[PDB]
Design a protein around this motif. Sequence first.
Motif: not given
Length: 468
Positions: A72-100
Motif C-alpha cells: 500500500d505504499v508503492g515501490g519500484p520492485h512490486g507487486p509486493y504480494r507474492q500471489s501476483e508474482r506467480l509467473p516470475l517464480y515459474q520462470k525461475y523454477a524452470e531456469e533451475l531445471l535448465k541449470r541442472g
Amino acid sequence: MVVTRIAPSPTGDPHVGTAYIALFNYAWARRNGGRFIVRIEDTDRARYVPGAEERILAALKWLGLSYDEGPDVGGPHGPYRQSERLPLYQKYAEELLKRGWAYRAFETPEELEQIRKEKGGYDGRARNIPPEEAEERARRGEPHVIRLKVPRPGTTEVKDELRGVVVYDNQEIPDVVLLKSDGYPTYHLANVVDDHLMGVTDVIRAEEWLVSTPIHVLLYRAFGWEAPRFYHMPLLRNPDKTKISKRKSHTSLDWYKAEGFLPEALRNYLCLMGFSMPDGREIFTLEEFIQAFTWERVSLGGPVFDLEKLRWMNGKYIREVLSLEEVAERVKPFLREAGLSWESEAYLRRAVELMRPRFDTLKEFPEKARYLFTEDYPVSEKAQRKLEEGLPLLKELYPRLRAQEEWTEAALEALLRGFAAEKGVKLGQVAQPLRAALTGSLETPGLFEILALLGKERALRRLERALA
RNA sequence: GGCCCCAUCGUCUAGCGGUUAGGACGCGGCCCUCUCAAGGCCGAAACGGGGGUUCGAUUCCCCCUGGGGUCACCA
Ligand SMILES: Nc1ncnc2c1ncn2[C@@H]1O[C@H](COP(=O)(O)OP(=O)(O)OP(=O)(O)O)[C@@H](O)[C@H]1O
Ligand SMILES: N[C@H](CO)CCC(=O)O
Ligand SMILES: [Mg+2]
C-alpha cells in the motif's frame, strides 16, 4: 545501502512475533539510512485468511513502524504480494531445471507419505527420471512439483551474523519442493527470488528459520547470486519457554489493542526482548531505539513474554510519557465501548487526571472510574458497610455542606477537617463513609478532589440518595 | 529420535579474567497519607555440573546436563 524486510504470511491475526521481528528490521534499516520493505507472503491458498493482510499492515502502522516499499505504499520492485508474482517464480523454477539444479517429481501426496514412513523423508527417487521423459510428462499435463536438486554428497556453510558459521552436511538438507503442482512456489523459492529482486541485503528473521537457511544459501548459489547477511532473532516464548503460541499466551496484536495497551508501550516492551540500552534505561522512544541499536547488544536467549511487566510499562507510559490530554483522548474509545458518556472535555480531562496513577490499561479507566460518568455504578459490600456505620455522622454533615458556598478542594477540606475536629473524630471516620456515598467504593482518588469534581448540586444530590 | 541453536535472580537483563555480580518487573517491609494507587527508601532472590586455560573464571575451550528450535506440495 541496507535493505531489510518483514514478510508476513496472511494466515491469521496480526501476531506479536511479527511486530517484534518487524521492529528490528525497521531499526536496522533506519540506523543505516537504508530501506525497510513489507512483502506479503500469500503463497498457500489453503491457509489464506481473507482480510488478514490489511490487518497486519494496519497493526504495523498502529505500532508506529513505517515502511518504504510495500502493498500500500508503492515501490519500484512490486507487486509486493507474492500471489501476483506467480509467473516470475515459474520462470525461475524452470531456469533451475535448465541449470541442472532442480528436477520434476511426480509423486502423489499419498506416495510421499508412504516414502516418508519407510525411509523418513523424500529419497530423491525422481532424480532418476530421464530429463526428456520428465519434460514430456509435464507437457502432457501430468501434475508434478519441482524440487531443489541438492548436490550430494557435500557440505553447506551458513553464516549467521550473531552466532557465527554453521556447517551443514548436505545429507541433512532435503530436496525441497520449490514449485507446487498448483503452480504456486513454496516459501523457499519465493523468498530467495524476491529478496534478490527487491535488493534485500540484510535478512533479519526469527530463529525458527535458521535451519532453513542452508536451503536458501544453495538457491542463491544455484542462481549465481550473492547471498545477503542473515541475523536470526531469538523466538518470543510462553511462560513454559516454548515458542509463544495462541494457547499459552496472547499473541494477537488486536487483543493488546482491544485490552487498552498503548502501541508505544507495547513497542517499547518488544525492544526489551533481546535488546538493552547501554545505560540500562528501560523507557525510551522508538527514535531513541533506532539511534542506539547495535547487534552487539542483542542477547540470544529465548525471552519469555511477561504480561505483568507489559502492564507495568503501559501504566508507566500513561503516567509519565503521554500528556494528560493524550491520555484523555485515548481513553474515549473505551468509554464509548463501556456505554459511558462524558459531559465535556474539561470534565473528562479532570477525571483522567484524578485517575492517572490508578489504571495500567485504557480499558481499566471506565471500569475503575465508572462512578464518575454514570449513576449506574456498583456499591461494594464493604463500602455499603462503611456507609451504614457512618450514616449518623453524614446526616449531621449534610447541612453544613448544603451551606458551603465556595465548593473548592481547599474550602471543602477545611470544612471537613473542622467537622471531624468538633466531632472529636479522625478525618478518616468521616471521609470513608462519604467516599462510599459518592463512589460506591473505598478505593478512589482523594476525597476533596472527588467531592469538588462533580460540583455542589451533583455531589449533594448523590449524597442525599445515600441518606435516603 | 537426527541435525542445529541457546544457558546470570521466578521473569527481562548488565557484565566482554579480578565487581560487595548491577538494574527492571514481580514479591516482602517502611515512609507518605482521608481510602486505594502513584512515588520514595530498604530487603529477600542468580552465575546448572565437571574438567581445563590461566597468578585469577560468571567471563575463554571441552564434555555432560538442561531448555529451545527444526525435520509439510505450511509458512
Ligand atoms: N512466535 C514467534 N516468535 C517470534 N518471532 C516469530 C514468531 N512467529 C513468527 N515470527 C517471525 O515474525 C515474522 C512473522 O511472519 P508471519 O506473519 O508469517 O507469522 P508466522 O507465525 O510465522 O505465520 P506462519 O504460520 O504462516 O508461518 C517472521 O519474520 C517470523 O520469523
Ligand atoms: N513468510 C515468512 C514468515 O512467516 C518469512 C520469513 C523470512 O524468511 O523472513
Ligand atoms: Mg543479590
